Amino acid sequence: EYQNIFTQVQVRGPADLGMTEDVNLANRSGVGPFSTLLGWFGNAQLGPIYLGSLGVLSLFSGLMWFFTIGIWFWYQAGWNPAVFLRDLFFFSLEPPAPEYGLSFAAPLKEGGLWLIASFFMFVAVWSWWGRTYLRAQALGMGKHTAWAFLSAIWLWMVLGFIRPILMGSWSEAVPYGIFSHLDWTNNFSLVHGNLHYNPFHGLSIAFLYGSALLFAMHGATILAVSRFGGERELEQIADRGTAAERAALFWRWTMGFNATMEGIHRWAIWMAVLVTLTGGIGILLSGTVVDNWYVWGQNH
Amino acid sequence: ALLSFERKYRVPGGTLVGGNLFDFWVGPFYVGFFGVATFFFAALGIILIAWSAVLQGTWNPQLISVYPPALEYGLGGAPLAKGGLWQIITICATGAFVSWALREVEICRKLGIGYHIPFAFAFAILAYLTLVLFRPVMMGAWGYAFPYGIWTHLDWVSNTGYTYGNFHYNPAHMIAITFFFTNALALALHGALVLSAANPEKGKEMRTPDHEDTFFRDLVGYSIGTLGIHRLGLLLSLSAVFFSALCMIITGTIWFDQWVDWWQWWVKLPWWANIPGGING
Amino acid sequence: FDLASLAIYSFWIFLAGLIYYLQTENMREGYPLENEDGTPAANQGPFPLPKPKTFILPHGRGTLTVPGPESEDRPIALARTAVSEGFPHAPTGDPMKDGVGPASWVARRDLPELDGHGHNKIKPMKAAAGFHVSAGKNPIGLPVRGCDLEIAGKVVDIWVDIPEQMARFLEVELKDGSTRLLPMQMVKVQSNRVHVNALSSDLFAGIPTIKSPTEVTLLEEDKICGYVAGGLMYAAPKRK
Ligand code: BCL
Ligand code: BCL
Ligand code: BCL
Ligand SMILES: CC[C@H]1c2cc3[nH]c4c(c3C)C(=O)[C@H](C(=O)OC)c4c3nc(cc4[nH]c(cc(n2)[C@@H]1C)c(C(C)=O)c4C)[C@@H](C)[C@@H]3CCC(=O)OC/C=C(\C)CCC[C@H](C)CCC[C@H](C)CCCC(C)C
Ligand SMILES: COC1=C(OC)C(=O)C(C/C=C(\C)CC/C=C(\C)CC/C=C(\C)CC/C=C(\C)CC/C=C(\C)CC/C=C(\C)CCC=C(C)C)=C(C)C1=O
Ligand SMILES: COC(C)(C)C(=O)C/C=C(\C)CC/C=C(\C)CC/C=C(\C)CCCC/C(C)=C/CC[C@H](C)CC/C=C(\C)CCC=C(C)C
Ligand SMILES: CCCCCCCC/C=C\CCCCCCCC(=O)OC[C@H](O)CO
Ligand SMILES: CCCCCCCCCCCC[N+](C)(C)[O-]
Ligand SMILES: CCCCCCCCCCCC[N+](C)(C)[O-]
Ligand SMILES: CCCCCCCCCCCC[N+](C)(C)[O-]
Ligand SMILES: CCCCCCCCCCCC[N+](C)(C)[O-]
Ligand SMILES: CCCCCCCCCCCC[N+](C)(C)[O-]
Ligand SMILES: CCCCCCCCCCCC[N+](C)(C)[O-]
Numbered sequence: 001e002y003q004n005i006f007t008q009v010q011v012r013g014p015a016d017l018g019m020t021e022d023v024n025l026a027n028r029s030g031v032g033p034f035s036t037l038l039g040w041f042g043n044a045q046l047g048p049i050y051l052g053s054l055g056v057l058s059l060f061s062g063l064m065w066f067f068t069i070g071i072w073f074w075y076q077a078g079w080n081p082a083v084f085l086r087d088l089f090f091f092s093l094e095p096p097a098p099e100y101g102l103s104f105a106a107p108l109k110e111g112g113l114w115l116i117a118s119f120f121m122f123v124a125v126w127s128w129w130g131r132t133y134l135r136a137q138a139l140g141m142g143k144h145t146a147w148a149f150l151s152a153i154w155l156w157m158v159l160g161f162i163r164p165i166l167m168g169s170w171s172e173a174v175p176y177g178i179f180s181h182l183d184w185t186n187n188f189s190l191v192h193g194n195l196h197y198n199p200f201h202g203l204s205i206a207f208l209y210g211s212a213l214l215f216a217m218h219g220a221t222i223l224a225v226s227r228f229g230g231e232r233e234l235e236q237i238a239d240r241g242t243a244a245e246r247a248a249l250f251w252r253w254t255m256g257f258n259a260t261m262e263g264i265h266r267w268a269i270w271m272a273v274l275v276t277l278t279g280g281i282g283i284l285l286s287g288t289v290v291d292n293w294y295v296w297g298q299n300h
Numbered sequence: 301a302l303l304s305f306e307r308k309y310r311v312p313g314g315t316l317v318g319g320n321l322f323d324f325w326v327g328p329f330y331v332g333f334f335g336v337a338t339f340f341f342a343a344l345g346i347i348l349i350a351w352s353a354v355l356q357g358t359w360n361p362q363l364i365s366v367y368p369p370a371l372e373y374g375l376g377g378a379p380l381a382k383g384g385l386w387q388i389i390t391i392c393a394t395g396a397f398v399s400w401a402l403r404e405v406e407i408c409r410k411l412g413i414g415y416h417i418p419f420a421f422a423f424a425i426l427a428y429l430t431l432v433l434f435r436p437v438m439m440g441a442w443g444y445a446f447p448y449g450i451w452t453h454l455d456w457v458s459n460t461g462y463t464y465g466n467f468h469y470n471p472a473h474m475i476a477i478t479f480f481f482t483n484a485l486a487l488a489l490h491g492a493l494v495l496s497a498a499n500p501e502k503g504k505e506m507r508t509p510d511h512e513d514t515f516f517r518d519l520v521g522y523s524i525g526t527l528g529i530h531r532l533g534l535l536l537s538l539s540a541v542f543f544s545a546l547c548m549i550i551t552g553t554i555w556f557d558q559w560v561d562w563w564q565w566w567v568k569l570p571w572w573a574n575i576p577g578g579i580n581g
Numbered sequence: 582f583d584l585a586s587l588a589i590y591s592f593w594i595f596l597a598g599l600i601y602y603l604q605t606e607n608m609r610e611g612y613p614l615e616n617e618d619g620t621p622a623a624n625q626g627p628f629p630l631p632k633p634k635t636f637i638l639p640h641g642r643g644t645l646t647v648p649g650p651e652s653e654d655r656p657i658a659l660a661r662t663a664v665s666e667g668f669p670h671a672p673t674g675d676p677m678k679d680g681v682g683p684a685s686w687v688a689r690r691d692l693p694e695l696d697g698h699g700h701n702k703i704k705p706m707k708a709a710a711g712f713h714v715s716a717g718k719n720p721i722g723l724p725v726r727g728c729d730l731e732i733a734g735k736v737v738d739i740w741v742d743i744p745e746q747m748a749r750f751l752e753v754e755l756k757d758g759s760t761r762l763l764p765m766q767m768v769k770v771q772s773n774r775v776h777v778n779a780l781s782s783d784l785f786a787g788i789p790t791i792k793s794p795t796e797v798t799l800l801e802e803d804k805i806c807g808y809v810a811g812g813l814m815y816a817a818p819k820r821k
């Protein structure tokens with residue numbers, strides 16, 4: 001039978017310019033081209049996009065961060081394009097050495113540049129957070145997106161800013177590099193006596209696994225009742241239909257309890273935000289309070 | 301007891317085996333033939349677990365660990381205390397996981413809905429069999445499978461990984477991780493987007509799905525749609541697990557060195573392989 | 582007793598309250614639990630019913646307060662098969678016509694779903710200025726074949742979800758000149774035909790009809806989709 005994974009017949013019409021509400025229409029781009037490719041899987045329309053001061057500041061500040069890491073990689077490559085492509089994943093922009101402590105006085109080639117890039121990244125991320133808030137506010141929506149985004153920002157703030165400060169050395173931050181930042185992750189665990197025995201790490205894993213579990217359940221459930229229009233979840237909330245009832249009854253008969261069309265999305269948002277919420281706590285306690293998690297674990 | 305709207309759905313029919321012999325509910329749980337099978341496999345595996353705990357000498361759930369047979373046993377049977385219990389418990393676990401999926405299928409039929417859910421659950425089963433069956437068999441010993449213990453099975457992950465240097469460098473391992481992170485990223489955005497529309501600012505009417513589309517076009521210039529995001533979430537989570545089974549079925553079977561060495565075909569391409577400078581020069 | 586021990590203990594307390602909260606939030610529909618005779622069940626579980634919340638629906642469609650007094654607002658043509666609880670309830674007549682089992686529908690509002698601007702969310706393409714088939718096979722004109730390998734009619738139009746630019750129904754003209762709507766998710770568009778495995782050719786006429794040729798209400802959508810999905814179980818005797 002038909003599985004509703006890919007659209008059978010695409011239909012296209014006049015582009016949707018979207019809701020107005022209190023959005024400043026001066027900052028909306030034009031509509032982009034339709035993508036028959038994306039139409040097989042989702043919507044084919046590209047754009048419009050909103051471009052305010054925060055967006056411009058984020059995009060610009062983010063490209064400076066990208067370009068700063070860039071010129072450093074070209075410098076490590078001796079400006080040779082061949083060496084650049086060969087060792088692209090091996091290049092790394094490292095933080096200042098431990099001797100500089102929390103000083104911004106490290107020369108550029110010894111962590112000064114890492115501090116500059118970190119400044120641009122800091123501005124780009126936080127201006128983008130403000131963006132997610134104001135876009136919801138302009139449309140009169142709740143701020144669930146901005147608050148869920150804070151959970152990711154929390155782990156990112158712990159890894160590269162909060163924890164290094166508490167440790168008293170920028171050298172405790174993560175380096176900018178494909179392979180180099182994997183190695184930093186590996187050493188962090190070895191130094192702190194195996195993160196497997198950090199309970200917040202184990203919790204973080206439970207919610208990471210649990211998020212793949214929950215989205216496979218939810219995604220499979222909505223597609224299984226899409227024959228009753230189940231993906232139209234807002235109206236199912238305001239006016240329960242047979243889609244919401246069958247969805248609930250499948251899971252109630254399967255495991256003994258069930259959700260509502262709204263309630264399942266509170267499960268979803270919390271399952272996901274607890275990943276980076278517990279994780280940021282585990283990392284923050286590593287080296288500041290606990291030096292060896294395996295040893296710490298054996299006393300409790 | 302029933303949900304206020306549940307009775308009209310509790311009709312007979314849909315079973316695959318036994319006709320109406322097992323076509324009934326216990327409280328909320330639907331039984332069916334495979335519900336009985338699930339219960340029988342589960343009740344056995346649990347008894348053997350308790351029996352292994354007696355042999356081990358502890359009733360603390362944090363210390364109980366059922367180990368597979370020693371490598372010297374190859375792929376043959378072992379005595380109960382020397383890996384046999386792991387072998388039987390693995391059989392029961394498989395029986396329970398498969399029975400669970402076929403029970404879900406019977407529920408899909410009685411409710412006239414699609415079979416997406418048990419299909420997705422089969423990927424999780426595939427991953428479990430990749431680690432306890434497919435990979436051990438290809439490597440030629442059950443001992444390569446992981447032990448059934450809360451903490452001992454984290455040690456297995458650590459030992460198995462570091463046997464190949466830093467498992468991070470397993471390229472299939474990178475892809476699976478990317479899907480896991482992206483999935484949690486997509487799950488958070490989806491839950492937040494629906495809730496933001498069903499629960500708007502104070503003094504506001506409920507939002508519409510158009511607001512959801514408009515919010516994401518304003519944010520990143522594209523909205524995938526109410527249907528597309530559920531297709532996406534299903535795809536992200538299954539691909540993550542798919543590449544997870546892939547990154548292990550190749551480890552120790554067709555690849556035996558440290559995974560960082562796999563990336564040298566790129567570094568040591570004879571043309572730029574000798575150019576001085578850079579990291580590798 | 583270190584700061585780490587207190588953090589992990591505080592979190593497990595936070596998580597217990599979070600679960601408690603999440604469960605009650607998911608009890609705003611379908612509770613309180615009923616006995617199989619409709620009366621309230623004695624054991625309702627350890628979690629209490631949540632306190633009412635109010636949604637203000639847009640376009641002046643009123644407010645919804647959940648939880649509230651639940652009602653099916655329709656007859657249920659089933660009957661007990663056992664004195665004890667937990668056994669199937671058997672149809673008393675035609676389950677496809679009576680809308681029970683997999684053929685069930687819910688008494689949703691007899692109004693069409695609207696978009697963000699107050700217009701009908703779904704519309705026939707002949708009434709949707711500018712919409713067309715952009716990729717894939719265009720089913721308009723193709724014959725519609727049932728699970729009995731007989732032809733029930735031909736596709737005459739596509740009902741489109743305009744905000745999402747998506748096909749949701751095929752309008753199929755029956756031998757008698759009338760039309761019915763078929764869920765897009767229950768048909769297979771092929772080179773020369775549209776195959777509907779859920780229904781036989783002589784069960785298309787039984788699909789509920791709509792009151793207006795240019796709109797479909799939420800009630801009619803549930804009745805149509807329920808009927809078609811119910812065919813998988815109740816039309817199987819003549820499925821070749
Ligand atoms: C997946 C790749 C690795 C692996 C790597 C890790 C790592 C690394 C970690 C875990 C962690 C856990 N793993 Mg393990 N684990 C594997 C295979 C398994 C299997 C299995 C049958 O294949 C099971 C049941 C478990 C079970 C568990 C839990 C004890 C724990 C949290 C998981 C979770 O919430 O997931 C998401 C699922 C949900 C949110 C749904 C609820 C699932 C519940 C929690 C399952 C409980 C199972 C119970 C303890 C055991 C069976 C009981 C029977 C009655 C006998 N692992 C394989 C070998 N697992 C974490 C931990 O804290 O370990 C101590 C951790 O850090
Ligand atoms: C040797 C390696 C160690 C180990 C060391 C670590 C370390 C170190 C860390 C983890 C962390 C994590 N580990 Mg561990 N880990 C090990 C073994 C495992 C195993 C396993 C099977 O054994 C598993 C399943 C995991 C799983 C996980 C996750 C639960 C967790 C990451 C959360 C997350 O989503 O981060 C991904 C999300 C983020 C990093 C958030 C970032 C958000 C920012 C704001 C994004 C900005 C992007 C930028 C601006 C834009 C780019 C361009 C765009 C196109 C616009 N680990 C072993 C024991 N693990 C983390 C954690 O929390 O631990 C408690 C962590 O720090
Ligand atoms: C030191 C350890 C090594 C390492 C070594 C390994 C090894 C070795 C493996 C992984 C595997 C994985 N690693 Mg690694 N990995 C490390 C670092 C990381 C980091 C990180 C940030 O550093 C991350 C994000 C990951 C991520 C991951 C995933 C891609 C994957 C685990 C998920 C999976 O397959 O689930 C699959 C899901 C399941 C197995 C669950 C199946 C559940 C069954 C079907 C049902 C159970 C029912 C239950 C018993 C019932 C209970 C009922 C009660 C009511 C509760 N690794 C480091 C470098 N990693 C594993 C993998 O790919 O496995 C295939 C694996 O074996
Ligand atoms: C495929 C994508 C993700 C996914 C999806 C998924 N899981 C699913 C489903 C889906 C779609 C279901 O429909 C099904 C379900 O009903 O979920 C509520 C299920 C399910 N996923 C579950 C767990 C689970 N899924 C996981 C992962 C994933 N599930 C993937 C990430 C994980 C981990 C560790 O990541 C776990 C632990 C269950 C809650 C449930 C299936 C329950 C089931 O089969 O029940 C019947 C079995 C019993 C009642 C008991 C069997 C016990 C054994 C006989 C003995 C124990 C032996 C065991 C090997 C001990 C090992 C323990 C140690 C390793 C700690
Ligand atoms: C959009 O619509 C949706 C819904 O409705 C509207 C939902 O309701 C759900 C379900 C999701 C939830 C309820 C969220 C919470 C779930 C989580 C966190 C997953 C993790 C779940 C668990 C840890 C629970 C696991 C429990 C069990 C496996 C049950 C234990 C098993 C038992 C007791 C045995 C089963 C019974 C039998 C075999 C029959 C008995 C046999 C006899 C012989 C008597 C989804 C996905 C959805 O999209
Ligand atoms: C032709 O090529 C050119 C040159 C044009 C390019 O553009 C090529 C460029 C690239 C290919 C770039 C490739 C990019 C990377 C490899 C980056 C990889 C990044 C990671 C793996 C993630 C690392 C991020 C983790 C860290 C370390 C985050 C730190 C964030 C902090 C919270 C910021 C802290 C701020 C500080 C210390 C000071 C600034 C100001 C404050 C007020 C705090
Ligand atoms: C072609 C232009 C592409 C630009 C992309 C920018 C970067 C986004 C990347 C990853 C996040 C995944 C996005 C998917 C999250 C969707 C959340 C959701 O629920 O969307 C449903 C729908 O949009 C509501 O109607
Ligand atoms: C850091 C974790 C954040 C919690 C995630 C869940 C958000 C719930 C809060 C809803 C926001 C309410 N409001 C009025 C601002 O829209
Ligand atoms: C919102 C869903 C809640 C899911 C809770 C899952 C609990 C998993 C338990 C993991 C064990 C963690 N610990 C502390 C023992 O390492
Ligand atoms: C790990 C936490 C426990 C997992 C199982 C939780 C769900 C149990 C079954 C639902 C309740 C059943 N009952 C009979 C009370 O309705
Ligand atoms: C229920 C059918 C599932 C079959 C797969 C189960 C895998 C068990 C592996 C252990 C085999 C032990 N044995 C029989 C060789 O002694
Ligand atoms: C590799 C895992 C094998 C186990 C699969 C058996 C359980 C049934 C899952 C498939 C049922 C879904 N479907 C679509 C095939 O009907
Ligand atoms: C000594 C106390 C240590 C911190 C304990 C952490 C538990 C509470 C934090 C949970 C997250 C709360 N919030 C606001 C993000 O929803």
Ligand SMILES: CCCCCCCCCCCC[N+](C)(C)[O-]
Pocket residue numbers: 594595596597598599602
């Ligand atoms: C049993 C103690 C419970 C206290 C711990 C915290 C429980 C509250 C959970 C968060 C509430 C969610 N909310 C309303 C902020 O969206």
Ligand SMILES: CCCCCCCCCCCC[N+](C)(C)[O-]
Pocket residue numbers: 256257258328600604625626627
């Ligand atoms: C992974 C943690 C999941 C926690 C699930 C606990 C909540 C189950 C509540 C069952 C009660 C529902 N009931 C039977 C009264 O309708």
Ligand SMILES: [Cl-]
Pocket residue numbers: 050051052053054055056131
């Ligand atoms: Cl902006």
Ligand SMILES: [Fe+3]
Pocket residue numbers: 218222233265490494
């Ligand atoms: Fe949803």
